[PDB]
Enzyme design. Structure first.
Site, short mmCIF file in Angstrom:
data_model
loop_
_atom_site.label_atom_id
_atom_site.label_comp_id
_atom_site.label_asym_id
_atom_site.label_seq_id
_atom_site.Cartn_x
_atom_site.Cartn_y
_atom_site.Cartn_z
N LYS B 220 0.81 -1.20 0.00
CA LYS B 220 0.00 0.00 0.00
C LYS B 220 0.85 1.26 0.00
CE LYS B 220 -4.36 -1.59 0.50
NZ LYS B 220 -4.89 -0.30 -0.03
N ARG B 254 -3.92 -10.32 4.20
CA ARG B 254 -4.16 -10.41 2.78
C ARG B 254 -2.97 -9.77 2.07
NH1 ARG B 254 -6.06 -6.92 -1.23
NH2 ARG B 254 -7.32 -7.94 -2.85
#
Ligand SMILES: NC(=O)c1ccc(SC(F)(F)F)cc1
Lengths: 274, 274
Positions: B220, B254
Site C-alpha cells: 500500500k 491479505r
C-alpha cells in the site's frame, strides 16, 4: 520523551528516541598464515563496514575469534593482534561508532585505545569483572548481556531480570554511570528454543530496570527451529523478531542483514510513533 | 481458546486459533480482444493460484477489473464474463477456499455459484446492501471492510468502529450469522498516510466488536510514504505491518508476497503463542 539523555559514544552521539538504532554485525575473516593486520583480512573488514554503513547501520559491531559465533580458544595477546588492526582501519574510514564484541578486559581495553567506542559483553561483566573497570575508566557505554553456564530456571523471566541486575551491580560498583549501561536479553544463549520464544514474548518486562535494551536475534537457531530453515533462509524470521522487539520497546537491534532490518525498523518506528 | 467456532467455508474449514491465515491476492490479467474465459488469461490465473498455494496461502482472493487496484467502470454483465471462468478453473484445480473481491451483489452471487466460498467487500455492504442478502442466502463468510467516501473524521478510531458496526447491522439485518462475519480496517482506503499509521497503531481496538479481523496492507501507498520506496520495494514495509497486525490480534492477512509473509506470520505465531 522516554529517554532524557543521549548515548555518549566519544565523538558520536546516539539519540534513543528518534528511531531504532541498527548495529551491524562484522565478524573477522581470519587470514591463515598471519596473526592479523594483513591487507586482505583488514580490507575485507573495511569493505564490509562501508557496505553496512551505506545500508543504514548506526553502529558497527566488531568481533574476534574468541567471541561468537566461533568461540575458539585464543589467548588475549593474539586476539589483540587480530582485532586491533581492524578497529584502527574501520574507525579511520567509517565514521560510525564502533563496538568491540568481547568479554575480556584487556581486549576491551586495547580495542578502545585502538578506537572502539562501546563495549559489548556476552558475559555481562561476570566472566571478567575487570571489564567493568575498563569501561568505567574510559567512560564508555557497556552492553551487558544475559548469559549463564546452565539451563536451570525456576522462572525464566524473573531469573533473567535477577541475573541482569547482578550484572548492573558489578558495573556500577566499578564506577560505570547509569547512562553508560545497556542491557541485552541474550536470546540464543543459555535458553531452550521454547525459552527463547518465551523471552521474546515477555521482552517488555526488561523495561522496568530503566535501561536501554539491545535485541540480538539475527539468524539465531531458534528461528531455524520454528521455521525449519537453514541459517541462510532466516531473513523473514529475523524480521519478525525485530518487529516484535521494537513493539516491546527495544532501543537497538543487532543484525547481519542491515538493509532489510533497517527498512523494517523504520516502518515499525513510524507505526508505534517513535 | 479465543475463538470457539471454526470458519465454515462450504467444504473447507478454517481454524482461527492455530495460526494466522494467509489470503493470497490474485488479480486478473485481462486479455484484450476478449471479454473473459480465454485460455491465456485463465491459465495465468490458475498458475498464479497454484504458486500461491505452494508458497503457503490458505485462501485465494480473486478480483475483477471493477475492484482494486483497477477500479475501472465495467458493468456487471461483463465482469461476470471475466471473473466466473477464473473461479470455475481455480476452484477446480486448487483445493483452497476462494474469496470473491467485489462490492456488487450480482457479481458475488455468480462467483459463489461458479464456486467461490467467501465474499470480500471493500464497501462493507454499504454500496450494494443486497450483497448482504446474497451472503445470507448462500450462508457464506462475508468480509466487511471499513471504507467511506470522505476523509472527515472527528475521531479516527471511534469513527472506524462506528462505521464498521453500521456494516455489521446491515449484514445481520439481512440474516447473516455472527460466525460468518469478518472485519477489515480498510487501511489504504479513505485515510491520509498519518491516519493509516494511526489505525495500525490502534488496531487492537477492533477486537472489542468480537469478530475475526482481516488485515490488508500489502504494498500500500502509506508504506511507500514512510520508506520513500516504489511499489516493488515494499516487502520489508509490508512485513512490518503484518507483524504488528498479528501482535494486535488479527486472524487473516491479505498479501501479494505469499512466501515471505507466510514465513513471518509463522514466526510471529510461535512468538505470541498462537
Ligand atoms: N531479496 C529479496 O527480495 C528479499 C527477500 C526476503 C526478505 S525478508 C523481509 F521481507 F524483510 F521480511 C527481504 C528481501
Amino acid at each position: 520523551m522516554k529517554w532524557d539523555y543521549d548515548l555518549r559514544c566519544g565523538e558520536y552521539t546516539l539519540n534513543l528516541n528518534e528511531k531504532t538504532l541498527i548495529m551491524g554485525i562484522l565478524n573477522v575473516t581470519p587470514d591463515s598464515f598471519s596473526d592479523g593486520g594483513s591487507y586482505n583480512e583488514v580490507d575485507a573488514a573495511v569493505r564490509h563496514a562501508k557496505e553496512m554503513r551505506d545500508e543504514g547501520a548506526h553502529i558497527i559491531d566488531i568481533g574476534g575469534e574468541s567471541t561468537r559465533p566461533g568461540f575458539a580458544k585464543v589467548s588475549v595477546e593474539e586476539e589483540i593482534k587480530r582485532v586491533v588492526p581492524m578497529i584502527q582501519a574501520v574507525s579511520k574510514e567509517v565514521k560510525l561508532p564502533i563496538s568491540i564484541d568481547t568479554y575480556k578486559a584487556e581486549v576491551a581495553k586495547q580495542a578502545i585505545e585502538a578506537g572502539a567506542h562501546i563495549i559489548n559483553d556476552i558475559w555481562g561483566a561476570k566472566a571478567e569483572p575487570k571489564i567493568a573497570e575498563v569501561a568505567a575508566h574510559y567512560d564508555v557505554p557497556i552492553i551487558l548481556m544475559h548469559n549463564r553456564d546452565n539451563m536451570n530456571y525456576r522462572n525464566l523471566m524473573a531469573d533473567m531480570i535477577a541475573d541482569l541486575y547482578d550484572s548492573i551491580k558489578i558495573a556500577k560498583d566499578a564506577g560505570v554511570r547509569d547512562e553508560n549501561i545497556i542491557l541485552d536479553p541474550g536470546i540464543g544463549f543459555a535458553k531452550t528454543p521454547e525459552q527463547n520464544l518465551e523471552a521474546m514474548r515477555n521482552l517488555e518486562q526488561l523495561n522496568v530496570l530503566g535501561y536501554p535494551v539491545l535485541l540480538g536475534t539475527s539468524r539465531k537457531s531458534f528461528i531455524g527451529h520454528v521455521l525449519d530453515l537453514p541459517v541462510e533462509e532466516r531473513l523473514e524470521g529475523t524480521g519478525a523478531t525485530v518487529c516484535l522487539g521494537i513493539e516491546k520497546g527495544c532501543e537497538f537491534v543487532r543484525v547481519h542483514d542491515v538493509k532489510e532490518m533497517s527498512r523494517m525498523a523504520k516502518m515499525m518506528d513510524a507505526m508505534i510513533g517513535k
